[PDB]
Amino acid sequence: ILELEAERELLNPPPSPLDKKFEQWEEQQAVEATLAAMKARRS
Amino acid sequence: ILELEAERELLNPPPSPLDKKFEQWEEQQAVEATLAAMKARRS
Amino acid sequence: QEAPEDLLERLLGEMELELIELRRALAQTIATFKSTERQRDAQQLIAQRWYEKAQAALDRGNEQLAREALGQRQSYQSHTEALGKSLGEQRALVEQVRGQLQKLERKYLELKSQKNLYLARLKSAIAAQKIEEIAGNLDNASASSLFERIETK
Amino acid sequence: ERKYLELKSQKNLYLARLKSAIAAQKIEEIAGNLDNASASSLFERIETK
Amino acid sequence: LLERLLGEMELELIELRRALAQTIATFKSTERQRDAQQLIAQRWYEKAQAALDRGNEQLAREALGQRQSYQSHTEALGKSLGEQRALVEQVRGQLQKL
């Protein structure tokens, strides 16, 4: 079972900590940015 | 797919920038010349 | 070898089969191309619903759900952003084939147009040879093939 | 599932592109028989007769 | 033999015509492949731009540093495309007189 999963990730770009950081950060920016529009609109 | 398109253009004269220029220019002259008759007729 | 002229009619006879088959194919292309647009529209509409629910979540101070709702929308946002760009680029995909086909028909009609003209010219000549070929039998005595041989008898 | 649907999604798009080309070659291939006398494959040979 | 020789001659010429297309098929194929690579570098370059924003220059170093791998790969392929242009020119010059 384990070898084939590794084969998949080998043929995959395993999301690096950078893209995990970027995707999390941009999500953290996306949630904040989406939040930022709402927090400003309500006033 | 790509080879056969090239075969067509090989057996074709691919419109050169000159004929593109001429056809565009004569069109630019045709539109202007057709326009020129109208712009003069209206007065 | 076979008379290549006869094949000409057969070739165009089978030609229309391809052209009509082509015409069928192109529609299926735009069928899906526009289908994704509707599918995109539903997805973004769902995101709007999630976005709207986040707006409702924000109301009354329940911002906690809005984070999930907005956070949930991010999944479809990326899916929406992914598909939206695919739709934009697929536009040129259908443009070239449209540009491919539009020139297609104008040629065949003119190609078929001159087909018949030269068939007449050929059939014009096959008569000229035969009337002259038979006129060889009915000649001015240069060959004496048929008539003059009788005059001998 | 999210992959297969998109995988199946683009499956049909390029089939059309392929079937688009198979027509382009054939119309041009037959247009070779009906040419501008560069090859004289079919029509010009008749003009000889 | 003269008639036979030209009869088999057209076989080579048409076989030639097929061959030349496969040449430009790849020649232009690398250009698209180059375009994707540089586009990826642009994405990495763009992500570095995003990394720079908000003061997270640390990722930009990796992102820009990551782009250097494709930059060299991009620079390598770009020059190959440029020189391959003359490769297809001579054969085109070869065939046109043919």
| DSSP character string of B1-43 | -HHHHHHHHHHS----HHHHHHHHHHHHHHHHHHHHHHHHHT-
- Take residue D11 and report the two structure tokens written for it: 């499956």
Subunit partners of chain D (3 or more CB pairs within 8 A): B, C
> Are C and A neighbours with ≥3 CB pairs closer than 8 A?
yes
Question: To the nearest whole angstrom, how far is the Cα of E59 from the nearest Cα of chain A?
Answer: 7
> Are E and A neighbours with ≥3 CB pairs closer than 8 A?
yes
- Which value, in Å, is the radius of gyration of the alpha carbons in chain C? 36
Distance between alpha carbon B19 and the CA centroid of its chain, in Å? Answer: 7
CB < 8 Å from D in window 40-99 of C: 90, 93, 97
The resolution in Å comes to 6.2
- The verdict on whether residue E92 carries a ligand-binding annotation is no
Other beta carbons less than 10 A from residue C83's beta carbon? 20
Residue E44 CB-density burial (10 A; 0-12 exposed, 13-18 middle, 19+ buried): buried
- Take residue C98 and report the two structure tokens written for it: 């449209």
Other beta carbons less than 10 A from residue B35's beta carbon? 11
- Take residue E54 and report the two structure tokens written for it: 């908000």
Distance CA C150, CA B10 (A): 63
Do the beta carbons of residue E44 and residue E68 sit within 8 Å?
A: no
Backbone angles phi, psi at E40, to 5 degrees: -60, -45
> Going by C-beta distance under 8 Å and a sequence separation of 6 or more, which residues neighbour residue D35?
D41, D42, D43
Approach to solving: cryo-EM
- Take residue E55 and report the two structure tokens written for it: 């003061």
What one-letter code names the amino acid at A37? A
**Which chain D residues touch C15 with a CB distance below 8 Å?**
27, 30
CB < 8 Å from B in window 16-35 of E: 17-18, 20-22, 24-25, 28
- The verdict on whether residue C116 carries a ligand-binding annotation is no
- Take residue E20 and report the two structure tokens written for it: 């030349």
Other beta carbons less than 10 A from residue C41's beta carbon? 13
Query: Furthest-apart CA pair in chain C: how many Å?
Result: 130
Q: Single out the residue of A26, D29, A12 nearest to residue C15, CA to CA.
A: D29
Query: Any chain D CB within 8 A of the CB of C30?
Result: no
Record: contact D21-B5, CB cut-off 8 A? yes
